[PDB]
Write a protein that holds these residues in place. Sequence first.
Motif, mmCIF file in Angstrom:
data_model
loop_
_atom_site.group_PDB
_atom_site.id
_atom_site.type_symbol
_atom_site.label_atom_id
_atom_site.label_comp_id
_atom_site.label_asym_id
_atom_site.label_seq_id
_atom_site.Cartn_x
_atom_site.Cartn_y
_atom_site.Cartn_z
ATOM 1 N N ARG A 1 -2.810 3.360 2.752
ATOM 2 C CA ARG A 1 -1.873 3.211 1.540
ATOM 3 C C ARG A 1 -2.233 2.190 0.622
ATOM 4 O O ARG A 1 -2.388 0.923 0.802
ATOM 5 C CB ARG A 1 -0.492 3.006 2.044
ATOM 6 N N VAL A 2 -2.250 2.748 -0.642
ATOM 7 C CA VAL A 2 -2.590 1.567 -2.031
ATOM 8 C C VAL A 2 -1.744 2.026 -2.678
ATOM 9 O O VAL A 2 -0.720 2.684 -2.984
ATOM 10 C CB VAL A 2 -3.908 2.111 -2.357
ATOM 11 N N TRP A 3 -1.633 0.930 -3.855
ATOM 12 C CA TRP A 3 -0.598 1.065 -5.145
ATOM 13 C C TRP A 3 -1.231 1.181 -6.400
ATOM 14 O O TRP A 3 -2.252 0.469 -6.633
ATOM 15 C CB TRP A 3 0.446 -0.393 -4.929
ATOM 16 N N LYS A 4 -0.640 2.068 -7.067
ATOM 17 C CA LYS A 4 -1.026 2.287 -8.625
ATOM 18 C C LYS A 4 -1.319 0.490 -9.048
ATOM 19 O O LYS A 4 -0.328 -0.249 -8.954
ATOM 20 C CB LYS A 4 0.142 2.698 -9.207
ATOM 21 N N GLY A 5 -2.358 0.298 -9.738
ATOM 22 C CA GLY A 5 -2.790 -0.783 -10.511
ATOM 23 C C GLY A 5 -3.610 -1.699 -9.498
ATOM 24 O O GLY A 5 -4.021 -2.855 -10.048
ATOM 25 N N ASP A 6 -3.637 -1.205 -8.138
ATOM 26 C CA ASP A 6 -4.509 -2.035 -7.328
ATOM 27 C C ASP A 6 -6.028 -2.001 -7.451
ATOM 28 O O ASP A 6 -6.377 -1.043 -7.957
ATOM 29 C CB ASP A 6 -3.961 -1.737 -5.901
ATOM 30 N N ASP A 7 -6.509 -3.156 -6.883
ATOM 31 C CA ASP A 7 -8.116 -3.096 -7.065
ATOM 32 C C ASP A 7 -8.603 -3.086 -5.577
ATOM 33 O O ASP A 7 -8.966 -4.279 -5.261
ATOM 34 C CB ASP A 7 -8.641 -4.122 -7.921
ATOM 35 N N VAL A 8 -8.322 -2.160 -4.965
ATOM 36 C CA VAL A 8 -8.830 -2.197 -3.496
ATOM 37 C C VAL A 8 -10.118 -2.342 -2.891
ATOM 38 O O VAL A 8 -11.125 -1.790 -3.706
ATOM 39 C CB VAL A 8 -8.003 -0.999 -2.604
ATOM 40 N N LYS A 9 -10.475 -3.037 -1.889
ATOM 41 C CA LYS A 9 -11.755 -3.771 -1.331
ATOM 42 C C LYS A 9 -11.802 -2.299 -0.160
ATOM 43 O O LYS A 9 -11.340 -3.081 1.002
ATOM 44 C CB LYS A 9 -11.960 -4.862 -0.970
ATOM 45 N N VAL B 1 -0.899 7.183 -2.484
ATOM 46 C CA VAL B 1 -0.861 6.343 -3.382
ATOM 47 C C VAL B 1 0.627 6.042 -3.870
ATOM 48 O O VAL B 1 1.181 7.026 -4.389
ATOM 49 C CB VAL B 1 -1.791 7.059 -4.813
ATOM 50 N N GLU B 2 1.092 5.044 -3.979
ATOM 51 C CA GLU B 2 2.389 4.631 -4.167
ATOM 52 C C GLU B 2 2.398 3.829 -5.392
ATOM 53 O O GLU B 2 1.616 3.259 -5.967
ATOM 54 C CB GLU B 2 3.000 3.618 -3.094
ATOM 55 N N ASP B 3 3.698 4.199 -6.227
ATOM 56 C CA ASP B 3 3.902 3.564 -7.362
ATOM 57 C C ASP B 3 5.354 3.075 -7.554
ATOM 58 O O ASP B 3 6.079 3.294 -6.608
ATOM 59 C CB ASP B 3 3.478 4.573 -8.423
ATOM 60 N N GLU B 4 5.832 3.019 -8.764
ATOM 61 C CA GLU B 4 7.306 2.552 -9.181
ATOM 62 C C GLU B 4 7.886 3.953 -8.932
ATOM 63 O O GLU B 4 9.068 3.711 -7.895
ATOM 64 C CB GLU B 4 7.210 1.977 -10.696
ATOM 65 N N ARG C 1 -2.307 -3.853 0.145
ATOM 66 C CA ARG C 1 -1.730 -4.918 -0.126
ATOM 67 C C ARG C 1 -0.776 -5.452 0.996
ATOM 68 O O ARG C 1 0.376 -5.550 1.022
ATOM 69 C CB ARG C 1 -1.021 -4.883 -1.524
ATOM 70 N N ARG C 2 -1.539 -6.173 1.953
ATOM 71 C CA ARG C 2 -1.126 -6.827 2.946
ATOM 72 C C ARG C 2 -2.257 -7.247 3.865
ATOM 73 O O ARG C 2 -2.232 -8.738 4.403
ATOM 74 C CB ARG C 2 0.249 -6.611 3.718
#
Length: 422
Positions: free
Chosen positions: A51-59, A134-137, A14-15
């Motif tokens: 680094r990705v985030w929970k709920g992400d839909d990474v490509k 994997v990052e989250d809240e 997410r950037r």
Amino acid sequence: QQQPLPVPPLLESRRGQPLFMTVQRAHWSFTPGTRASVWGINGRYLGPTIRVWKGDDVKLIYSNRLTENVSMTVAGLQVPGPLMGGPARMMSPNADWAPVLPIRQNAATLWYHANTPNRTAQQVYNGLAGMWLVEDEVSKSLPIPNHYGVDDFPVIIQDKRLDNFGTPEYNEPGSGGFVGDTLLVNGVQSPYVEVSRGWVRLRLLNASNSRRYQLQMNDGRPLHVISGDQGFLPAPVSVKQLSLAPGERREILVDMSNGDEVSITCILVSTLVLTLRPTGLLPLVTDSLPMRLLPTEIMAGSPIRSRDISLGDDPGINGQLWDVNRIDVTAQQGTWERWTVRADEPQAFHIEGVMFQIRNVNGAMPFPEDRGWKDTVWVDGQVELLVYFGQPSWAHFPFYFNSQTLEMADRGSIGQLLVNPV
């Protein structure tokens, strides 16, 4: 004079936003005044920390610029079999694979690496691996160091046999896993990391072919564990010694407020892993350990099926060698199972597309420590795991449970797990 710890560049989702993973050659310095051609991702030894985030839909866009067939996978990733890797998604030279991963698991410290058949040990040993976060809240919420490269570091511990000129040489042991004599952290030998006077977060990871380390501070101080192959523990665990098997990952918190230098320690030429040195002024009066990490110690449910996984002294599971056309285990998505894993000859065991809790260790109880969510466990005799299958798989895109001693997986110590939906 020791060298500084190299920190792989951070490549979050997410950037930017395709994540370009180019497997390619090398030129790394495992030692001063030397240079070797190695393997990695994006012109580095090993790779960049993802680094990705929970709920992400990474490509993710994987591109093979290597001189052979390659299949990549993310250890501990929670996704359907068709999105894992490895043999089902093999990449030939100049071939590319661009999956779209849906992240839906809690924050954790994972890792990616090559798992090419019959060739995993040599590909990983070549420097084809890296960290995956994997990052989250919850994670970025706790009062814990989270500034990557500043107070949060990746400690990828490695076992190497470098020739005199500084080139890692891998001479096939065969009977057992590979064992080196030179400790490497992030590609450099016993480096030092300049940290500030405060709490320091270390993400340890054993990317060794088979060697298992028992770490501790050269000053006797306890050592605060907060994770966690598959996530944070209910609450910090202070221990004197820490066991870390290949493929295993653990996050520890270190208090460098006193100001004095501390090193992590574990035949090997040197038992020094990493040195932490305070660099300058104070906080103040910054953070004591949180009392509880996991908001809820939401734990294991009842099993409806039990299994007996046996390894031993020779390659294969339950006396059978890996077979792409054979389904060894058929579980039901969203159920609980109890797996009894045994091993005459000590080794790590891993299960894809799942997460479990160690309930027993040789009829005894597991450490503090090993009571969270995991996907990799050290076996020396027998262990009981409470497994949860939250992801689905297909007969031709199954999940793999394997011996985590690379030389043996590459040799037949692999099983295929089929998880039915739902």
